[PDB]
Amino acid sequence: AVCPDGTRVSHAACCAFIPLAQDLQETIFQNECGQDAHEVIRLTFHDAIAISRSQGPKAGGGADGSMLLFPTVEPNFSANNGIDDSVNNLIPFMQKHNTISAADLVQFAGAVALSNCPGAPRLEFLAGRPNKTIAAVDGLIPEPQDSVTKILQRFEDAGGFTPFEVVSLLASHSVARANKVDQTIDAAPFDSTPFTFDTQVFLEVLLKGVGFPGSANNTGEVASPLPLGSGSDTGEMRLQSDFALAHDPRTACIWQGFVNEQAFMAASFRAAMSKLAVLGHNRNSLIDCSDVVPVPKPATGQPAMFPASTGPQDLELSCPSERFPTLTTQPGASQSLIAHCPDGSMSCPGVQFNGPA
Numbered sequence: 001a002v003c004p005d006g007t008r009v010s011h012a013a014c015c016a017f018i019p020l021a022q023d024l025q026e027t028i029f030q031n032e033c034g035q036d037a038h039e040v041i042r043l044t045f046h047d048a049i050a051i052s053r054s055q056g057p058k059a060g061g062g063a064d065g066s067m068l069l070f071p072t073v074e075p076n077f078s079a080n081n082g083i084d085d086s087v088n089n090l091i092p093f094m095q096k097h098n099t100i101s102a103a104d105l106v107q108f109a110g111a112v113a114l115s116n117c118p119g120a121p122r123l124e125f126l127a128g129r130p131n132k133t134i135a136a137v138d139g140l141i142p143e144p145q146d147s148v149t150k151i152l153q154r155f156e157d158a159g160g161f162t163p164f165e166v167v168s169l170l171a172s173h174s175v176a177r178a179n180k181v182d183q184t185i186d187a188a189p190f191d192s193t194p195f196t197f198d199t200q201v202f203l204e205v206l207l208k209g210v211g212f213p214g215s216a217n218n219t220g221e222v223a224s225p226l227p228l229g230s231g232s233d234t235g236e237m238r239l240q241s242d243f244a245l246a247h248d249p250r251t252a253c254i255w256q257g258f259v260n261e262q263a264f265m266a267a268s269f270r271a272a273m274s275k276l277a278v279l280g281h282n283r284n285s286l287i288d289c290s291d292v293v294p295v296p297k298p299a300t301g302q303p304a305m306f307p308a309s310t311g312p313q314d315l316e317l318s319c320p321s322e323r324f325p326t327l328t329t330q331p332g333a334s335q336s337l338i339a340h341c342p343d344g345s346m347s348c349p350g351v352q353f354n355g356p357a
Ligand code: HEM
Pocket: 035, 038, 039, 041, 042, 044, 045, 082, 142, 143, 144, 145, 151, 169, 170, 172, 173, 175, 176, 177, 178, 179, 180, 181, 239, 241
């Protein structure tokens, strides 16, 4: 088909997504893997995971836009704390680009946000999800204080995800920060490169913890290897769940398998996201509009490195059957501060709209 902007697309129905992508970039992302992007990416996951095979259809409809359609329900469950901001940012687009369902909008926005992150894969995008659904029940969202067994059961019950796929999805923590875990500090990154979709997160969770970026008594948080912060440049935070998955006999080797394996990580994540994006739907009934997803930003091609002040002696290995790669260490006597802004600055407020959530 040929869209009103001359763009040759696969199916005419995919044409509407073109103006939506540009609106999202101009209005809330500004072509950066920043704050707003990170929040949207998380919403994609929270919207999709709320579904249960065992409990049945009444428990939730998966990737159905329920977060946008019922803003006063799910966003208020304790496990969804902090999600309100992204819901309020997306609602205006739902109202404007009114030929696109809330469900499609959520998934597409995630694909767009991710494309702004260097190293990220170009996600598959299928459209056609219905604009009507029900509010999901509480308890379907995995929490940081959960055990590995519990986390794996949840993902299995949601859509038959295997342990490999679960760890694959956690690649998103390479461009993630925390605002609600510790209320005294904001934007605590999960790895030293929160604006780069690389394998640093997998390496840094394997290092020995030496302190906490804020308070020491927070549910779901464990000691961090890079706690030092100053001003807006908050220190690194480590979640119990990530730490646990990196050391459990069932997931230890899978976790290590991604260290310094950029292409393998990206491809595995794309595969897992392919499944997650259609939870609650039959993929044979959705149209393929992958060609309308923006081309992602390229990485530099550099391998993973031990951040300054850390080295091989700080590793807490758990996979007995695979050799840990030889990596270099970035020079320096002490820890470098992790920048709060992608342009290196320490001041960069993202656009935020007021809304019902
Ligand atoms: C395995 C279960 C998971 C747990 C327990 C978990 C937990 C968390 C927690 C506690 C935060 C911090 C939220 C805050 O306080 O602001 C977070 C952030 C985030 N997570 Fe997860 N997560 C999980 C899976 C995933 C998956 C599968 C994705 C995939 C899209 C994802 C994407 C994100 C992103 C992008 C952020 C950062 C948001 C921001 O920077 O504002 N997470 N996650």
